[PDB]
Amino acid sequence: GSHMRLSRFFLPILKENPKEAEIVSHRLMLRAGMLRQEAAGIYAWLPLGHRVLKKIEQIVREEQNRAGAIELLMPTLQLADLWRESGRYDAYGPEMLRIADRHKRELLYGPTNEEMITEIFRAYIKSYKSLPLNLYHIQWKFRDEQRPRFGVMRGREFLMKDAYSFDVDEAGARKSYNKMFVAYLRTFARMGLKAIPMRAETGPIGGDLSHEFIVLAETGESGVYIDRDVLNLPVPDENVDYDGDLTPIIKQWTSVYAATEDVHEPARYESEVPEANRLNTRGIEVGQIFYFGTKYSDSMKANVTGPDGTDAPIHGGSYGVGVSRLLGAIIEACHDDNGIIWPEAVAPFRVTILNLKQGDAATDAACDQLYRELSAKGVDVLYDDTDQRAGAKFATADLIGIPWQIHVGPRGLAEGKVELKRRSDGARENLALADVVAR
Template sequence: MRLSYYFLPTLKENPSEAQIISHRLMLRTGMIFQASAGIYAWLPLGTRVLRKIEQIVREEQDRTGAQEILMPTIQSAELWRESGRYDAYGLEMLRITDRHDREMLYSPTAEELVTDIARKHIKSYRDLPRMMYQIQWKFRDEIRPRFGVMRGREFLMKDCYSFDLNYEGALVSYRKMLEAYIKTFSRMGLTAIPVKADSGAIGGDLSQEFQVLASTGESLVFYDQALDSIVKNKGEVDVNRLMSLYAAEEGLHDPQKCPVPEDQLKTARGIEVGHIFYFATKYSDAFNACVTGKDGETIPLHMGSYGIGVSRLVGALIEANHDEAGIIWPESVAPFIVGLLNLKPGDNKCDTLCEEIYHKFLNQGIEVLYDDRNERPGAKFANMDLIGIPWQIRVGTRTMETGQIEMKCRRSGEIQELSFESALTSLKKRMAT
């Protein structure tokens, strides 16, 4: 993509309405545009990051055997009355009346609808287990939307639902999701600690939140230091070990009852990005969602719910990956892998070489943003640092003299001179791992 044609409305100054780093940087880099309070349009740069995150989430869900569906954002109030949550949910639910005076709502979550699907189509123990997920927009009418996409009213969420014959089966599904979440966040370069949590309005007996560790996090998390090595591991996850280790938020942490020795207990700030629940037969009882067992008995479905805030993760990633110059994207979620900078636009040799390099990247399947604008080098450097592309390839007068390009690592700040072919080989190796 050529920057001269790319819609990237960056800002030089911090917007006055943005209170936290991720909100400031998302506005400054032109990732989002505020449409109204707590509601944002996602512009090209932000959309690319959102889709990268979405794809990682999708791949790890698929590996568990969960199957993707898509449910409507507008749901019937009657379904929610069956569960008893239509009135109980409170003012966060956006209620709507259609032209026929039917009461509808903009979905804040989808337990009711997915249970309705299950009760009509899952009839026998032979149909179990089942897991279904969607990546869909939700709406919760926050009284004070703030912090940009971290606490907006409209948000993109992955919500998965499991259906099992009994507690033992439900626990298998829960453990699969627990492992999938660790792998998902690890692939994004995040340290996410699963902590004991309150089930809230959804209900449930077993519940854990995933807190991404970041110095700017709004929650204080206490956890066994042994968790560090597990959640950062990109290989197999020891689920038994993971579930045995202590982690809790400040409100649920009791120093007197904490099983972890003081010298092994760590504290950190965290940002909630996911939540998993097992809620037994709470919804299947309300909806009479049952299957026929081996001996002909009627058995209510055991269910679990597993959410990841996909759009919220964009903000969390920035909170955990930034410096004074701007964003530092992990390669797995970066909008582009390479930023190609033409430091002498208008010079025939430099323009020709940059075009050659640009097309070589494209032919190798490497996502590149080519800054071909007639701007000063300093402005181009600052812009690339701001939007956080992992690698910068700089081509200028010195390149014409030595045949060497400059390659800058955004995260470390290290700049090295090497041939373009060496740079290309290095990037291809990184993409292959």
């Protein structure tokens, strides 16, 4: 169980709202000592911020692994000549950061990895017997966004989990897509979010294999239109049979209307949804699933021999979760006027011990014992042991969004008690000291 004394940590709280922050998540990430801008759209993750980033990453990896995807890692830099194979090199646009090395070879900072994962696959896989195959990584990307804005939510250097599926045909690809559909429901639910799968912009094919998972938010950059029954639907549990038929889960989550502004058609919204169920708002895109078929396998000649002995190009899909963007989206969805309210699964620490009389022998000893006992038992524990008054300590503890606070003072200890406070709702309970660790 991770453990830190605030005095041996690095957590620079800002007293004042930063004028450069336009939205609440950006404001709070800066105020709560989580983030520092290094260039437009390019950030250092300060210790508290990095802890959350890592919690998010691990939840994503866990669900990808559950769904059968296999983790690897591609480099940040890629050869232009690879992108020339697919014809994306000259068609991608100015968001692609192009680089020349000392030998004048043409490189780029990868904005995504379709060509590269296809290059890897086609080196090693030649039989339909290796498929379905889903390979993924969690890696830093760069898109040279014209106007970086909104802190971690519209920047340039961002962290993404990007997964790529390989199948013999469209039928198998739909099964691979369904696996990721289910994994994403579970991923965002585990973060305390209702990220709704919404039908999204398709490619030149058309079809129905394009969804964006969007958390409803009014500072959000995506316009959306939904049927409110979608917000009530049940998320599959951890025993979901990923080798089985997933269609019933998908049917459930798509049986009721949900579309982004790209594929939204005002006349359909009415023939399906009751007027009292209809809602038109805005949101943050945190996940994207997309079938692309033979887009890369045709141009890059990524073929496998089929059950019938003929070679044919594979069918692929891509699945992205914006891991660094999620820090912003989560704060947008989970805060109040006193600061952040971390869902437990993503919080940097689960409990903070607040010593209300720093230097008094009895309160110090009590906090020292709690801190030691909580860590011994696997609990992520922050000990606020700074030379600050109680009210100073409450405000910082509230701001940074730690799920639980333990208040320790001379007053409470005279009676053998400490106060336990829940951040989400302000529940408070004056407990015996010997009971508090049995949570």
